[PDB]
């Protein structure tokens, strides 16, 4: 399932470059190894996908991502983002790691507000639906 | 002591005890329309069954099967029939079972042997013709270790049932009068030899509006009796329900709405016994308190459908859902103004070949 | 599937909220599909306001209780070219 | 053993099949006539399998529906006719034999 | 015609094959009452336990004789008309091949 998720995100990347910056051709012209460390349970597995595309884009243009921008989501092969499950444990894990920004599918704006206010202090969220939003909340 | 337990197990069994049926159609009407709304097709079939048994003399067995999305009320209709015909009821799940001995007991020379489940049903139900309800035929444990589902044919085959016998008390029983019924979410997984025997009735889904008329009568009062409240203190207008079903639960079955209304009532119970209101009255403004914020909202994700995406209905394993199909370029297209390579497709999304 | 590709080809969007289904023949004939009643209720939940079925199943869809079918606007079809003219222009 | 021609099934069911099922539903011949024409219509439309099993289901069903019209319903002697039939067993299933023409 | 010549009764094997629902089993039973031999159905479709055709050792706890002894015990004749079913679908597994049996 992660393999199809990977190819989906991959093709979306290949589309995003030509839609965005035609002069680059790094993606369509080069082999690429990509490694996702284990630990995610298969059912939440797709939630990693939104990270994947930004990985490649960082490798693609070569600019570093803005620091400590944790995220999760699920990519649609046409730029929609989709809800993921089990967010509360994810957010506390981001708290332990010193995260100071975060991005979630807008469809999960509900669960994040269930959280106790002390949990939410010091984070800085960006709900999103279409993927292009994230492109401007990382790089520039 | 072993043979004594065996004598007991044998004597309990009816051999000709025949719980009598009512057979007038009128009373069967009244007892069916007051228990389950709609799903009239199964009612009509059972009605024809009643009509034939009354003609050809004696009581009659028959096999039938029900199938459809989970939580449509299948198991619920079973008991309603059980008190309709006046047959005694007995559920018997078999999803994932593999112990053919469980369907047939044990040799009685084994330590701890006891007769298969059916004999327990004969001892308990005391009729020769109860309403056995095999459950989840689709999910029977079908292994290398001897498929019980093959063993089931000895029960359910109209001819081979007539002298069924079980390892505990060897003497054949005569199950012909039993009225078996079978329930499966999808009919195709069912093993082929068995599938041909039983009749295949089809319970359906439910329209969004249809759930409204459902829940106001057969559902809210049920949970109201489960939480121990009386109507005096826990009214729920219809409007709250239509809002619920339209938003908080997108499932063709009613189980999920059943979870919500359960939750609302039990929270109401907490507001009564110690809380503030002496009579909670959920109103649309109040509800989001009790059950929290809405979960689903944006039914049908895309709305403009950007080029190259189209909706497609799909008769999934449970209910039906409006999954989209999507496509996209994977390389710059004009790789060569003269280029002649077939624009090979690459399908994805857990294709079966 | 085919409408996806053709939509992508010319690149124009599909007419809005026009769900469809079928089974294609490699020469533009369409074929009966199974289980229509559940499909239709699911399309009703999604706010669908048009729908397209193989003409061979114009039978089963009409067995449905009248209240389920109110408010839809069906277009039965057999040859595939039909559906093409009921989607894009 | 072979299959069966469309016409052949008529001569089959008219003798060895209808009476048998008629005895299964507990009826007597007095009340449940089925002209030949309805059987040929059945076999022509509602079941395309070389075996007779599917037609066996249809006519069984039709008879038992007749039983329901008898025991409480109106007629003391149901008489199926082709105009009557779609009532009893519903709409035609197959029609466009040979997809292309 | 042949059994009448060479004195005593004689057994023989035969096979039928064709589309399902052609009536195969029905003639089987019809022959059983034609010749006057006893009938006994015996499905073998999809089975893989050769012990079922041969019983068990009798030293195992709960061993019981194979199916055939039961048919012979039941019809009480030495020469019944056994009807093996669904030879095509015999479960041909590693667990002891019935096809050898
Ligand atoms: N039309 C209906 N009339 C009455 N109850 C219904 C109806 N549809 C669904 N239900 C309810 O659905 C619930 C579950 O139904 P049942 O088939 O018994 O179990 P499940 O559907 O969970 O397998 C029951 O509690 C039952 O009251
Ligand atoms: N030519 C025929 N003559 C008599 N009965 C027939 C004929 N063709 C089909 N049948 C009926 O078809 C039914 C099934 O036949 P049989 O071989 O016993 O089962 P199956 O065909 O399912 O293997 C029987 O009930 C039988 O009466």
Length of chain E: 101
Q: How far apart are CA B299 and CA B322, in angstroms?
A: 10
Residues of B in contact with C52 (CB under 8 A): none
For B7, B59, D27, D80, the CA distances from B56, given in Å and listed in that order, are: 36, 8, 7, 21
For tokens 């269930």, the residue is: A114
Crossing angle of the two packed helices B40-55 and D53-71, in degrees rounded to 10: 80
Which ligand is located closest to the Cα atom of residue B221?
A: 1
Instruction: For residue B178, report the phi and psi dihedrals to the nearest 5 degrees.
Output: -65, 155
Q: How far apart are CA B12 and CA B101, in angstroms?
A: 20
Instruction: Please compute Rg for chain A using Cα positions.
Output: 15
Q: Which helix (H) or strand (E) holds B67?
A: strand B65-67
What angle is formed at CA C67 by the lines to CA C66 and CA C73, rounded to 5 degrees?
A: 75
Describe chain C by its helix, strand, coil percentages, rounded to 5.
Answer: 45, 15, 45
CA dihedral A89, A94, A100, A101 (to 10 degrees): -70
DSSP string, A24-72: --TTTTS-------S-S-GGGGGGGHHHHHHHHHHHHH-PPPPTT-EE-
- The CB of B215 under 6 Å from ligand 1? The reply is no
Q: Please give the method by which this entry was determined.
A: cryo-EM
Q: How far apart are CA C40 and CA C53, in angstroms?
A: 10
Report which of E91, D85, A9, E10 is spatially closest to residue B145, judged by C-alpha positions. E91
Task: Find all residues with CB under 8 Å of E16, minimum gap 6, and list them.
Answer: D1, E24
Under 8 Å between Cβ of D33 and D80: yes
Contact call for C59 and D96, based on CB within 8 A: no
C8–chain B nearest CA distance, Å: 4
CA neighbours closer than 13 Å in the CB half-sphere of residue B65: 19
For tokens 């999305």, the residue is: B69
Q: Residue E28: is it exposed, middle or buried by C-beta count within 10 angstroms (0-12/13-18/19+)?
A: middle
Under 8 Å between Cβ of B77 and B183: no
Instruction: For residue B22, report the phi and psi dihedrals to the nearest 5 degrees.
Output: -80, 150
Q: How far apart are the first and last CA of chain E?
A: 32
**Residue E42 touches chain D, beta carbons under 8 Å:** no
Copy the structure tokens of residue B347.
């399908």
The resolution, in Å, is 3.9
Task: Find all residues with CB under 8 Å of B5, minimum gap 6, and list them.
Answer: none
Q: Which atom of ligand 1 is nearest to the CA of B78?
A: 18
Length of chain A: 140
- Give chain C's count of helices (H) and strands (E): 5, 2
For B61, C13, C31, C35, C61, the CA distances from D99, given in Å and listed in that order, are: 42, 32, 9, 21, 20
Residues of D in contact with C29 (CB under 8 A): 99-100
List, in sequence order, every residue forming a beta bridge with E40; answer none if it has no partner. E82
Q: How far apart are CA B54 and CA B47, in angstroms?
A: 11
Contact call for C29 and D91, based on CB within 8 A: no
CA-closest residue to ligand 1 atom 26: B73
Say how far residue E1 (Cα) sits from the centre of its chain. Answer: 24
Q: Report the binding-site residues of E for ATP.
A: 18-25
Under 8 Å between Cβ of D95 and C58: no
Under 8 Å between Cβ of E93 and E52: no
Collapsed DSSP state (helix, strand, coil) of residue B225: helix
Q: How far apart are CA D28 and CA D18, in angstroms?
A: 11
- Residues of chain A numbered 19-48 and touching chain B (CB < 8 Å): 22, 25, 28
Report which of B188, B190, B161, B138 is spatially closest to residue B315, judged by C-alpha positions. B188
- Residues of chain D numbered 57-86 and touching chain E (CB < 8 Å): none
Report which of B59, B146, B63, B132 is spatially closest to residue B97, judged by C-alpha positions. B146
Q: How far apart are CA B152 and CA B171, in angstroms?
A: 18
Report which of B99, B61, B95, B252 is spatially closest to residue B184, judged by C-alpha positions. B95
Under 8 Å between Cβ of C7 and C80: no
Strand B280-282 versus strand B65-67 pairing type: unpaired
Q: How far apart are CA B43 and CA B33, in angstroms?
A: 9
Residue C37 is a catalytic residue: no
Collapsed DSSP state (helix, strand, coil) of residue B96: coil
Q: Residue B173: is it exposed, middle or buried by C-beta count within 10 angstroms (0-12/13-18/19+)?
A: buried
- DSSP code at position A10: H
For tokens 């949990």, the residue is: A119
Under 8 Å between Cβ of E43 and B152: no
Strand B131-135 versus strand B89-93 pairing type: parallel
Q: How far apart are CA A4 and CA C24, in angstroms?
A: 26
Least CB–CB distance from D65: residue in B48, B54, B56: B48
- DSSP code at position B21: P
Q: How far apart are CA B130 and CA D22, in angstroms?
A: 27
The runs of H, that is alpha helices, within chain B are 2-12, 25-33, 40-55, 74-85, 100-104, 117-125, 148-156, 192-195, 208-214, 220-226, 238-247, 255-273, 284-291
Task: Find all residues with CB under 8 Å of E2, minimum gap 6, and list them.
Answer: E10
Under 8 Å between Cβ of B290 and B267: yes
Q: Residue B190: is it exposed, middle or buried by C-beta count within 10 angstroms (0-12/13-18/19+)?
A: buried
Which ligand is located closest to the Cα atom of residue B78?
A: 1
Report which of B15, B131, B151, B117 is spatially closest to residue B62, judged by C-alpha positions. B131
Contact call for E18 and D3, based on CB within 8 A: yes
DSSP string, D13-57: IIIIIHHHHHHHTT--GGGEEE-HHHHHHHHHHT---SSSHHHHH
C19–chain D nearest CA distance, Å: 25
Report which of B113, B88, B100, B236 is spatially closest to residue B168, judged by C-alpha positions. B113
List, in sequence order, every residue forming a beta bridge with C86; answer none if it has no partner. none
Instruction: Please compute Rg for chain E using Cα positions.
Output: 16
DSSP string, B186-220: -SSSS-HHHHTTS-B-------HHHHHHHIIIIIH
Residues of D in contact with C63 (CB under 8 A): 90-91
Under 8 Å between Cβ of E67 and E84: no
Contact call for D91 and C31, based on CB within 8 A: no
Phi/psi region, residue B181 (left: phi>0; alpha: psi -120 to 50; beta: rest), is beta
Q: How far apart are CA B102 and CA B141, in angstroms?
A: 12
């Amino acid at each position: 399932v992660m393999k199809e998720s990977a190819r989906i995100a991959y093709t979306f990347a290949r589309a995003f470059l030509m839609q965005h910056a035609p002069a680059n051709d790094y993606l369509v012209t080069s082999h690429i190894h990509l490694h996702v460390p284990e630990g995610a349970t298969p059912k939440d597995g797709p939630s990693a996908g939104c990270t994947i595309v930004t990985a490649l884009l960082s490798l693609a243009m070569g600019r570093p991502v803005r620091q400590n921008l944790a995220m999760t989501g699920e990519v649609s092969l046409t730029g929609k983002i989709l809800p993921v499950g089990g967010i509360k444990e994810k957010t506390i894990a981001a708290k332990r790691a010193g995260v100071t920004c975060i991005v979630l599918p807008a469809e999960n704006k509900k669960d994040f507000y269930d959280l106790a206010a002390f949990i939410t202090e010091g984070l800085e969220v960006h709900f999103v639906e279409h993927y292009r939003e994230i492109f401007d909340i990382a790089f520039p | 002591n072993v043979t004594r337990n065996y004598l007991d197990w044998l004597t309990s069994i009816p051999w000709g005890k025949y719980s009598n049926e009512n057979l007038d159609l009128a009373r069967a009407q009244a007892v069916l329309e007051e228990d389950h709304y709609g799903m009239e097709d199964v009612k009509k079939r059972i009605l024809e069954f009643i009509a034939v048994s009354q003609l050809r003399g004696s009581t009659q067995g028959k096999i039938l099967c029900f199938y459809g999305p989970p939580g449509v009320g299948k198991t619920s209709i079973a008991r309603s029939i059980a008190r309709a015909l006046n047959r005694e009821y007995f559920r018997f799940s078999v999803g994932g079972m593999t112990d053919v001995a469980e369907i047939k007991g044990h040799r009685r020379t084994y330590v701890g042997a006891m007769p298969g489940k059916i004999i327990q049903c004969l001892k308990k139900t005391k009729t020769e013709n109860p309403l056995i309800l095999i459950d989840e035929v689709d999910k029977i444990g079908r292994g290398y270790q001897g498929d019980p589902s093959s063993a089931l044919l000895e029960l359910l085959d109209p001819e081979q049932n007539a002298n069924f016998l079980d390892h505990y008390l060897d003497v054949p029983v005569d199950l012909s009068k039993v009225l078996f019924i079978c329930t499966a979410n999808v009919t195709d997984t069912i093993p082929e030899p068995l599938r041909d025997r039983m009749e295949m009735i089809n319970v359906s889904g439910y329209v969004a509006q249809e759930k409204l008329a459902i829940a106001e009568r057969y559902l809210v009062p049920q949970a109201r009796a489960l939480c121990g409240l009386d109507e005096s203190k826990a009214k729920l207008s219809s409007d709250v329900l239509t809002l619920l079903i339209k938003q908080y639960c997108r499932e063709s079955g009613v189980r999920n709405l059943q979870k919500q209304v359960e939750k609302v009532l039990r929270k109401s119970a907490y507001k009564i016994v110690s809380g503030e209101a002496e009579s909670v009255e959920v109103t649309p403004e109040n509800l989001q308190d009790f059950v929290g914020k809405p979960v689903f909202t944006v039914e049908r994700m895309y709305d403009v459908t950007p080029p190259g995406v189209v909706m497609g209905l799909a008769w999934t394993a449970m209910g039906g859902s409006t999954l989209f199909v999507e496509t996209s370029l994977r390389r710059p297209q004009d790789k060569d103004a003269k280029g002649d390579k077939d624009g090979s497709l690459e399908v994805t999304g857990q294709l079966g070949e």
